[PDB]
Amino acid sequence: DCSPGIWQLDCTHLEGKVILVAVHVASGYIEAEVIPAETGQETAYFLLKLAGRWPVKTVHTDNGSNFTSTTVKAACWWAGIKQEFGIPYNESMNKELKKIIGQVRDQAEHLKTAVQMAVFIHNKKRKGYSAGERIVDIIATDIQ
């Protein structure tokens, strides 16, 4: 998709741990972190954090049951976030992010550190704007 308010939110597993990945669809910009466990509390918290930082209008996921908890629904309600239905189920940021995580894995002891390093590398890499430059360009243009 390409609307500037659309985000994709999924969890991946690595080293018996859970990584929450949010992708700004229009830009490829990512935010991610290791979460203690795959729960509605964690997801709702991540969403509130995301919505305070970017203009999040709609969120899609590849696992719809991710968004059934009362806590998630309350976070989306409070922040004014809707579920995206204009993206069908049939990218692979998860493999690409895991590729980068594997590249920097030894640069840190804890996976959570490695994940942030990978996010940094992903968002700054030019290919020629970076995802980080693209998101601010897309959002700033959408204001004016």
Strands (E), 41-122: 58-60, 82-83
Interaction of residue 106 with ligand 723, rule CB under 6 A: no
Question: Closest by alpha carbon to 47, among 9, 12, 97?
Answer: 9
Which partner in Ca ion, ligand 723, a copy of itself, none is near 109 (CB below 5 to 8 A by kind)? Answer: ligand 723
After which residues is the chain discontinuous, taking C to N > 2.5 Å?
A: 90, 127
Q: Which amino acid is located at 27 in the chain?
A: S
Interface map 37-76 toward a copy of itself (x if CB under 8 A)? --------x--xx-xxxxx---------------------
Alpha-carbon distance of 33 to 31, in angstroms, equals 7
Residue from 15, 62, 64, 78 binding ligand 723 (CB under 6 A): 78
Interface map 62-91 toward Ca ion (x if CB under 5 A)? --------x---------------------
Residue from 14, 18, 34, 74 binding ligand 723 (CB under 6 A): 74
Measured in degrees and rounded to the nearest 5, phi and psi for residue 33 equal -160, 155
Alpha-carbon distance of 2 to 13, in angstroms, equals 27
Interaction of residue 106 with Cl ion, rule CB under 5 A: no
Binding site for ligand 723 (CB under 6 A): 41, 44, 70-71, 74-75, 78, 107-110, 113
Binding site for Cl ion (CB under 5 A): 109
